[PDB]
């Protein structure tokens, strides 16, 4: 009976809620009363990467912490040397509509995609010297919200069809399709172990999928609106969700509940890109009001403001060594902060 | 200097990339991008032939102007978080079929198709991202409209009607009703022009609308208004 199944689902939800309530005694805010505050962090724009002629929608750091891949609506991915503002090579995209990019951990492949429902993966290290399109993965019935390289042969890509997929490069097919999100999946972040990854979507839900198995281990729903960005804690046992409710939330994998929110009255706009510092004590989140706010992690306090962007900030990243913050925005200017 | 020979060559390659980027951007600035929208019956595909999966792009040159039509009807997802991807389109082409005044939706037949088109037009025209983006409204399928109008009055679609059932008066009424949903009347302009299946002149109206919008954008950038 459908009514019986709905009753069983409601009972399961009530049991999960009771378990979550029982597992919590004192919030992360209470436990961190005696922790020394981070203090105001004064950060300046060391480098400004001009050259894009349209709104920038995504930007990803390489492993080497010097190379930066930036995708813009002008239809050209640009690879920048961050130390000295140099364009390594520019890739003319087939579809001018791009909403994601990725730099492989090896550094040989660069992925992109967008409203073309196509995951275009290009090979940089080529004998011919140009940058050809190695693969054009197809099979998503919606916009490509995010794409991340697990390794040189597999890529995790989330689409607006309420699905995510683990594509193999050589075969070009979806090895494992992760479905279960009610709304359109809008961002994904891989754990450092490259075994679990959490995808946040339209349904105010972040689901932690296991790559090897292919099922949603846990689902965390604490927001009230769209989830636009997500980023793992450096440990891998927690992550951060940025929503249109103007509040980031820190979700712990093992506790399976919201550890602490990041809300302040004067900011009502949404959150587009959320990143973490190398130590994890800092949460840089790119808000919808032409700004990026650096919050404390152990406390819900404003550690700093990265003001200086003219327009909406869409991409936000942190180097592996944590020496810089790229906070590219819609005014076609990547900005390196330190 | 304080740079290596390899470093200097890298800077020069960056300069060449910059020159190519500037050339491509100058080519694209002269170019015009249009966003084509449809609701319900979505007869725009038909009129697609008159000026000529995810985003469908059609490039066509008219009077030395390079138009880039974008059709998005196959996206079928949350519009509100990809609509902002077309901020800065020169104009939006909204194709509404007059035959929809009586034809009802496939699902929930209690709702009229023309009213659904009106709701979508309200959503797009009055959207925050498209405050400065103009709208070109083709009231297409006028032939079938003329064929069918003398069967039932527009009361079936719009009860608040006090006009005759001729093609011209009904066309004026539907044009005015569609235009009434533009809340920000001063910020954007609606260029309305009725079309049919067999029309070889709609490209001319598109061209006139885009040249008007381009001049308006240039005037605003220069600060005249």
């Amino acid at each position, epitope marked *: 009976e459908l009514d019986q199944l709905r009753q069983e689902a409601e009972q399961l939800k009530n049991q999960i809620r009771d378990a979550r309530k029982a597992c919590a005694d004192a919030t992360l805010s209470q436990i961190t009363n005696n922790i020394d505050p981070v203090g105001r962090i004064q950060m300046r724009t060391r480098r400004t990467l001009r050259g894009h002629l349209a709104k920038i929608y995504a930007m990803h750091w390489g492993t080497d912490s010097r190379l930066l891949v930036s995708a813009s609506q002008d239809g050209k991915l640009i690879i920048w040397d961050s130390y000295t503002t140099n364009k390594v090579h520019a890739i003319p995209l087939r579809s001018s509509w791009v909403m994601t990019c990725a730099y492989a951990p090896s550094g040989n492949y660069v992925a992109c995609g967008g409203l073309d429902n196509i995951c275009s993966i290009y090979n940089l290290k080529t004998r011919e010297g140009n940058v050809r399109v190695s693969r054009e993965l197809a099979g998503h019935t919606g916009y490509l919200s995010c794409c991340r390289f697990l390794d040189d042969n597999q890529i995790v890509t989330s689409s607006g069809d309420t699905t995510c997929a683990l594509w193999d490069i050589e075969t070009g097919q979806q090895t494992t399709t992760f479905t279960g999100h009610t709304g359109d999946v809008m961002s994904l972040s891989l754990a450092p172990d490259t075994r679990l990854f959490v995808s946040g979507a339209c349904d105010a839900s972040a689901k932690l999928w296991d790559v090897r198995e292919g099922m949603c281990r846990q689902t965390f729903t604490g927001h009230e609106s769209d989830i636009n960005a997500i980023c793992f804690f450096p440990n891998g046992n927690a992550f951060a969700t940025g929503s249109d409710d103007a509040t980031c939330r820190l979700f712990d994998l093992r506790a399976d509940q919201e550890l602490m929110t990041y809300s302040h009255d004067n900011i009502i706009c949404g959150i587009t890109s959320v990143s973490f510092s190398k130590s994890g004590r800092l949460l840089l989140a790119g808000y919808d009001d032409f700004n990026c706010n650096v919050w404390d992690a152990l406390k819900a306090d404003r550690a700093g403001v990265l003001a200086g962007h003219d327009n909406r900030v869409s991409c936000l990243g942190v180097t592996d060594d944590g020496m810089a913050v790229a906070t590219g925005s819609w005014d076609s200017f990547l900005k390196i902060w330190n | 200097c304080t740079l290596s020979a*390899e470093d*200097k060559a*890298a800077v020069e390659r960056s300069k060449m990339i910059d020159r190519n980027l500037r050339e491509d951007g100058e080519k694209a600035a002269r170019e015009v991008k249009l966003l084509l929208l449809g609701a319900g019956e979505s007869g725009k595909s038909t009129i697609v032939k008159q000026m000529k999966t995810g985003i469908v792009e059609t490039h066509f040159t008219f009077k030395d102007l390079h138009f880039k039509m974008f059709d998005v009807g196959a996206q079928r997802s949350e519009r509100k978080k990809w609509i902002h991807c077309f901020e800065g389109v020169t104009a939006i082409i909204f194709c509404v079929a007059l035959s929809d005044y009586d034809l009802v939706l496939a699902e929930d037949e209690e709702m009229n198709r023309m009213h659904e088109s009106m709701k979508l037009f309200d959503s797009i025209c009055n959207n925050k991202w498209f405050t400065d983006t103009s709208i070109i409204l083709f009231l297409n399928k006028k032939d079938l409209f003329e064929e069918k109008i003398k069967k039932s009055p527009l009361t079936i679609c719009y009860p608040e009607y006090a006009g005759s059932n001729t093609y011209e008066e009904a066309a004026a009424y539907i044009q005015c009703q569609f235009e009434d949903l533009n809340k920000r009347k001063d910020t954007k302009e609606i260029y309305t022009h009725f079309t049919c299946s067999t029309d070889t002149k709609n490209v001319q109206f598109v061209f006139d609308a885009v040249t008007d919008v381009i001049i308006k954008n240039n005037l605003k950038d220069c600060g005249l208004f």
Partner: single-chain antibody
Amino acid sequence: VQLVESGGGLVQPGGSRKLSCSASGFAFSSFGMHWVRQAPEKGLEWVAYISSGSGTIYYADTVKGRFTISRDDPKNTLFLQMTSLRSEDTAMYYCVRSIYYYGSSPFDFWGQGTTLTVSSSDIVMTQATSSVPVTPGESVSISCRSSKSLLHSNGNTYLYWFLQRPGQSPQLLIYRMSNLASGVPDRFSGSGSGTAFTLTISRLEAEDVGVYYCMQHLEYPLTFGAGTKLEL
């Protein structure tokens, strides 16, 4: 990828010729081109270089004024116009592709080369050995001292090791003293301290035979070395 050259042969002295290196198999517009020389029984010597877009045209001291190096990008060809020949230019000329960005591999591919015969403050690197008998499967070291410190302030060493097999065109082995060019076995390795550098070969094979040359890349004079010859 091929860079076959055309033009040369026996030339009356003091005249004029042209060497045309045909570019095919790769995007020649985005690559700088180096013309390098090879005396009949002597080592290498940099001659000329034109960058992408022909905006950077440098020459060696010996070939200033007399030489000219140009590129037809739409035609995918490299031209070397030669005026006022002397007896010192009797040699084999190679056209070399070099792309220049972060993590690039300059001098990646070398053309076969064309032979020419006429009738009758630069870093001087040395490979004092210049000859070392070897046995297969043996780890060997090959040194190339530098006059000035190739360790630039940017943090990149600028020593290149190439290998030329007998009767062939030189092929890149190591770039920037640590990085390995694509298509080179992992046995080859490089080390240095900014002034003294050395290759290390874990195991020697038939392919490893030939002559190894060291290149500086700080100042554009780009002096090679005498090179070390491997003999079984």
